[PDB]
Design a binder for this molecule. Structure first.
Ligand SMILES: *[C@@H]1O[C@H](CO)[C@@H](O[C@@H]2O[C@H](CO)[C@@H](O[C@@H]3O[C@H](CO[C@H]4O[C@H](CO)[C@@H](O)[C@H](O)[C@@H]4O)[C@@H](O)[C@H](O[C@@H]4O[C@H](CO)[C@@H](O)[C@H](O)[C@@H]4O)[C@@H]3O)[C@H](O)[C@H]2NC(C)=O)[C@H](O)[C@H]1NC(C)=O
Ligand SMILES: *[C@@H]1O[C@H](CO)[C@@H](O[C@@H]2O[C@H](CO)[C@@H](O[C@@H]3O[C@H](CO[C@H]4O[C@H](CO)[C@@H](O)[C@H](O)[C@@H]4O)[C@@H](O)[C@H](O[C@@H]4O[C@H](CO)[C@@H](O)[C@H](O)[C@@H]4O)[C@@H]3O)[C@H](O)[C@H]2NC(C)=O)[C@H](O)[C@H]1NC(C)=O
Ligand SMILES: *[C@@H]1O[C@H](CO)[C@@H](O[C@@H]2O[C@H](CO)[C@@H](O[C@@H]3O[C@H](CO[C@H]4O[C@H](CO)[C@@H](O)[C@H](O)[C@@H]4O)[C@@H](O)[C@H](O[C@@H]4O[C@H](CO)[C@@H](O)[C@H](O)[C@@H]4O)[C@@H]3O)[C@H](O)[C@H]2NC(C)=O)[C@H](O)[C@H]1NC(C)=O
Ligand SMILES: *[C@@H]1O[C@H](CO)[C@@H](O)[C@H](O)[C@H]1NC(C)=O
Ligand SMILES: *[C@@H]1O[C@H](CO)[C@@H](O)[C@H](O)[C@H]1NC(C)=O
Ligand SMILES: *[C@@H]1O[C@H](CO)[C@@H](O)[C@H](O)[C@H]1NC(C)=O
Ligand SMILES: *[C@@H]1O[C@H](CO)[C@@H](O)[C@H](O)[C@H]1NC(C)=O
Ligand SMILES: *[C@@H]1O[C@H](CO)[C@@H](O)[C@H](O)[C@H]1NC(C)=O
Ligand SMILES: *[C@@H]1O[C@H](CO)[C@@H](O)[C@H](O)[C@H]1NC(C)=O
Lengths: 324, 167, 324, 167, 324, 167
């Protein structure tokens, strides 16, 4: 029988299949998937700064010091904020927060954060500082209020015109929060604040604000038809903020020093901290991938692969292999 | 396939050739066996690896923060974000799916090419000292021992040494 | 002559041409176009819910009951709203509509819509309910007004303070509309409303509004220098809305029950209904295609092919064919 | 073309072959005619059809509502939408046009390949029992009747039956 | 020695390299780059209308006539506006500009622009028109003010109620600018304007505005705790604007005729005019290219190539060439 | 390469052939030299030129005004623009880089194809009147002067004129 030599190619026991532009379900000797489908099921640090996780509190409740939220623990910096879909503790006394979404966006990523006392509660000599409480905002079974602001009321049937300044002597921007109380009628107005017609004026180098209480008959929320409306500004270093008011004033006690470099966003997730680190976070877990694509979740924060609607992206590496 | 070798005139692959992608099977009075072509296998491994890495490495990744920060009276702006998000999803989905289909076609045709080229390199050495069977095999008109078989794999086959015996 | 066998390929009488990356105008035996260029010239249902087509009325005129618009016919649901570019009938009495674009966006797609009477016109015992009319808003050759709101004026040189509540006993969100009249001077103010200084307060669980009439000398529009400014809110089930006013109040008579699931938009088109169904609507007609691309119009509503600036996308199917 | 057959060494197509894409023309003392290669034609139809369907089916379509809902003091936001819209138009236009040009090149080269492979399959059967003319045709050194012609189309041509007559 | 003929291909002395999908650093006989990397380093006309280059002035300072800015030179049309990052001359008297960003966007590209006098300074018979000056706004070493508006004050301890109309007799839209002065306290209020409680009402066919001065204690900016807040509107042809006020009124003297067709934007750049023309401008120079891509700058105005993050896009033209 | 000619069985290029991309080198008793194949060179120039022009011309360019017009309390809208801008940058960067890599592969394979096709055209003319060396060259069994060499380049080589001398 004459000698022969033959040319051929590798086959093996692979059942892996790929699709080509002209042909589906081609069995090949080796294939590789370029779609990331795996996450770790946890909320992690981002490169590698921890997130601010608010548990059952909203950003507003956290900032204002809603007593129903947990005690304020110092977190000097964070990469993103995690809020639950519907935090049970938001504004314990019902009302509104002015430019709330822009504030939450400003606070999403913070390089330095420090709460300081700017106007001591004990410094209100001509007003009653410890009578502004409600059963709506309980603290240890006792009627209370947002802990970082002060609900001032009249003393001895008198509300003398307030004139306070705080000067930002610190070397950092200062987030300052205050509010106005909108009562239900004129009888309540005079009962709380004596003076029938009132205002709150606030000025900085840029801010020129004058608020007045709007009366209206309103539906009860948590048993109350009154409303607290909160405002904020950023006080530059070496600038000063000037308050003037003859009623309805929810004064600041604490403010927050801020250093902002980057910006991120608010993540809605029901997960808790996972003591991990990642470069790409989703609300159902972090992903740790060099892959170009992923299909886990669109609401990601970080440096992530491109989000696609696909169950698989498998590249052929090896050869056309006979199937089973 | 495009080059007509793999699942073509070479009708199937070799389970018995475990140490490479392309190569040779010989049969003579001393025995038979498979030998991988190391050079063509390594070039192919390098080429396919470079393609995959290019598909991965050429992606520009950068930091983004994706959330839902617009309120109940900012639904028009929210819709603007939706159209943008969905748009990018559509673009990347289509391009990712087609890229995979198209490059998979190219990879398989690449293997086919490599096999065909290996075949031709042997054909041109042997010329009329062997019969081209049509199935990837050549039937020698002369005795070709293990050393002679190696010279064919090496690209060192000496045609004029066997001419007379071939006649 | 010796026998022969030859290998070859199909040719035919096709003059169809395609372009390739290396060569233009290649005649082929069979080609296929993947660009949709055809529409039906009609406004159709979307999958398969009819649109709300407003003919010569704006959304505001339709909602408020502009008498110059057509009589209100019940449409319980719709997929999108069709407005003409410039509806001739909008606000018959000149003025403004607060957050109008957001309202139109909210109303773009509606699952359930039902107009109901919430405050009967006949229930205003201490005010004149049928004297608020203008030649600007005619209804059957007689001076009239927006039919769904009531322009209240003084009775017997008196405008007693109004205090009304409507409670949403229905199981659905309620869209409520009201307005304020901005007169031209103090003489007109007292002539219409007796009281010289007036307000309109409106409250819900979330809303805390107090409007006041702004006086200004203004250009005449349709012969009138006065202005009607309208507002709206969404009243949740089991919530109540409280109005209080001593003048200038354009009171609600009818409101609209709403169930909202999806959202869409406002289509600007001059076409009328076509008694058809489609998955993709454009302002110049609907398209019924499985093709990946189209070049008909960018302002589409539905599940549409991708919009391109191209006159043709022709794929080769068959072989290189000799030309004529 | 890439494979050198269509409008290459096979200089033109056959109007007379109506029942397939690729095939054979024979000429002997009994007559002449065209016969489609059914197998290669059907594979080609399946492949091209799959390509077109893939270009169509891999598109992700989803509901969007495109309008103009921003007012006279929201022109900056309106411009943001314009840049987005125009951007997607640019992306899809460029990718659609290039996809067509590139895939059309691939389709025509696919046909060319199929023809070349059919040619080679015949060449390897005939070997030296026929002369390769260079125009797609083989000139037999022996008589090849209709049954013999069928065996060539079938891949059943028996070379050693005609060897002696070929000499 | 027997004759031979050989088939081969071109080689040359090229060291140019390209990358392929399967192989990097392939030396070829000829290559071509499709990435534009070159700019001319200049600010040019756009097709071929010159930009409005504001040097050290902001749009607001330019429009209002800030005396610290350069003298107003007529420019009848422009394609885009060039502002420096931080113009030193903006509002010489500190304050705010209402809807400033939308105004700058409206003015970005202008087909016709002409400044006209609508209310002569000399026409204020019952008020003092030349006493409204400040050391903050110097003009030739003398205290002055924004040159296109007039800071009116009381004459002989009297501020009679102002009632002025300007009617747009021109055939073009008119941009009109006015302001309100927010003083520091009631003593300053009466000192400047006599009347203690004041307003500014402004009306057109569409506008219905009534401003009031907000008092607040504010930080000094350029030595002043007062604030000037400016407003604007577009007055249609044949429409008229009606002002009424009893104090704090910064009246218009000049307004601007406008014809608007296209829209563009504000470019931030430190470069000056280059006496050139282009179809695509970036802040560091113009680009003159038919190339599909460029990597110069993202903030472009014009018809530009697609912006990419790439140092090179080199296509092979010629053949695989042996390297050195 | 895919077609096995350039840097394949034809192991390197010719510095000496300056007037074209592909062609012939001859050697006989009258001398030796290089001759460009004008037809195949021009077709290749036309094809590659069309590809480049298509990559350039199919781009839809349109007027856009890119700035930063949102203020300090419009950061959410500013972020929306950022995601859009960065998104388009990502898309165009990836597609531009891959397009270059993929088309460069196609261009080089195109040249390889053209060379292989030129080779085959000569092979089929010569048949057995010359020996196929395996390196791109054919060794004549007969004398082939300058006129005979020209007939090979022309596609006018008369095989039956030299048959007897070839024996
Ligand atoms: C919030 O933060 C700081 C708080 O210190 C503040 O900075 C100071 O601002 C005030 C503005 O009035 C200014 O006070 C004046 O100081 C001058 C002399 O200032 C010189 O010396 C300073 C200290 O060594 C130095 O810092 C300065 O650069 C400067 O060279 C003084 O003459 C003034 O007194 C006035 O003159 C009459 C004369 O009859 C006195 O009777 C009367 O008491 C007047 O006040 C006055 O005391 C101080 O210099 C500023 N220092 C700074 C900026 O470092 C910020 O301005 C403040 N921000 C806001 C928005 O309020
Ligand atoms: C709009 O929609 C509904 C209208 O019905 C309303 O729901 C009712 O809200 C009121 C709030 O005041 C509430 O009325 C009270 O009812 C209690 C007894 O309520 C019990 O029985 C109800 C009926 O069977 C049941 O629905 C409740 O869940 C509950 O178990 C009654 O004791 C109150 O009377 C008050 O007490 C003094 C005693 O001196 C009386 O003299 C005086 O008349 C006081 O009013 C009072 O009548 C009622 O229960 C609510 N029902 C509901 C929610 O189903 C919504 O609250 C209203 N929304 C708004 C925003 O206004
Ligand atoms: C800003 O721009 C122009 C300024 O001219 C203005 O146009 C004029 O607007 C006024 C509105 O009152 C109008 O004046 C009336 O004219 C009629 C007669 O008008 C006829 O003739 C005009 C001139 O040939 C012609 O233009 C008109 O089309 C029309 O056919 C006159 O009878 C009126 O007089 C009134 O009647 C009583 C009788 O007791 C008089 O005693 C008393 O003086 C009354 O005024 C009055 O003079 C004029 O016709 C308008 N012309 C136009 C539009 O071309 C714009 O309306 C103004 N825009 C704003 C918003 O203010
Ligand atoms: C396939 O073959 C490989 C290599 O011999 C072996 O390791 C693997 O376990 C096999 N798997 C099977 C037969 O399922
Ligand atoms: C390819 O495989 C999938 C299952 O993995 C099957 O659903 C699909 O229909 C197959 N297509 C063909 C043509 O076999
Ligand atoms: C082309 O040929 C087909 C098939 O025979 C025929 O049906 C069609 O009418 C022809 N058209 C022409 C010659 O224009
Ligand atoms: C291709 O055909 C079109 C007309 O359909 C023509 O305008 C264009 O110039 C042609 N190009 C070439 C190279 O023939
Ligand atoms: C390369 O060769 C060309 C053509 O002869 C010549 O013009 C060029 O100067 C050369 N460059 C070198 C050797 O660097
Ligand atoms: C290709 O060339 C570049 C330098 O121009 C070098 O940095 C890179 O590593 C090279 N890659 C290879 C595989 O040679």
């Amino acid at each position: 029988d004459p000698d022969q030599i033959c040319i051929g190619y590798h086959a093996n026991n692979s059942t892996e299949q790929v699709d080509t532009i002209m042909e589906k379900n081609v069995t090949v000797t080796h294939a590789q998937d370029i779609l990331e489908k795996k996450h770790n099921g946890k909320l992690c640090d981002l490169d590698g700064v921890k997130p601010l996780i608010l548990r059952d509190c909203s950003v507003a409740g956290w900032l204002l010091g809603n007593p129903m939220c947990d005690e304020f623990i110092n977190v000097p910096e964070w990469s993103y904020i995690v809020e639950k879909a519907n935090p049970v503790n938001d504004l314990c006394y019902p009302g509104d927060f002015n430019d709330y979404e822009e504030l939450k966006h400003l606070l999403s990523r913070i390089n330095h954060f420090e709460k300081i006392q700017i106007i001591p509660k004990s410094s209100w000599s001509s007003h009653e500082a410890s009578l502004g409480v409600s059963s709506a905002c309980p603290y240890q079974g006792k009627s209370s209020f947002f802990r970082n602001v002060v609900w001032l009321i009249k003393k001895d049937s008198t509300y003398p015109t307030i004139k306070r300044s705080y000067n930002n002597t610190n070397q950092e921007d200062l987030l300052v929060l205050w509010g106005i109380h909108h009562p239900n009628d004129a009888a309540e107005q005079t009962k709380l604040y004596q003076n029938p017609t009132t205002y709150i004026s606030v000025g900085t180098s840029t801010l020129n604000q004058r608020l007045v209480p709007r009366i209206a008959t309103r539906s009860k929320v948590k048993g109350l038809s009154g409303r607290m409306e909160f405002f904020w500004t950023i006080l530059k270093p070496n600038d000063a903020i000037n308050f003037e008011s003859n009623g309805n004033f929810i004064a600041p006690e604490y403010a927050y020093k801020i250093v902002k470099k980057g910006d991120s966003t608010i993540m809605k997730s029901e997960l808790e901290y996972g003591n991990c680190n990642t470069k790409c976070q989703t609300p159902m877990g972090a992903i740790n991938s060099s892959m170009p694509f992923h299909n886990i979740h669109p609401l990601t924060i970080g440096e992530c692969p491109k989000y696609v609607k696909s169950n698989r992206l498998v590249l052929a590496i090896g050869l056309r292999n006979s199937p089973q | 396939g495009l080059f007509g070798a793999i699942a073509g005139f070479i009708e199937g692959g070799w389970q018995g050739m475990v140490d490479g992608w392309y190569g040779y099977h010989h049969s003579n009075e001393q025995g038979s066996g498979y030998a991988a072509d190391k050079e063509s296998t390594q070039k192919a491994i390098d080429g396919v690896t470079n393609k995959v890495n290019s598909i991965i490495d050429k992606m520009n990744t950068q930091f983004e923060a994706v959330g839902r920060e617009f309120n109940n009276l900012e639904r028009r702006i929210e819709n603007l974000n939706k159209k943008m998000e969905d748009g990018f999803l559509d673009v990347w989905t289509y391009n990712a799916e087609l890229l995979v289909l198209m490059e998979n076609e190219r990879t398989l045709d690449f293997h086919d090419s490599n096999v065909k080229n290996l075949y031709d390199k042997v054909r041109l050495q042997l010329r009329d000292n062997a019969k081209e069977l049509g199935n990837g095999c050549f039937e020698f008109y002369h005795k070709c021992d293990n050393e002679c078989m190696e010279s064919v794999r090496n690209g060192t086959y000496d045609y004029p040494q066997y001419s007379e015996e071939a006649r």
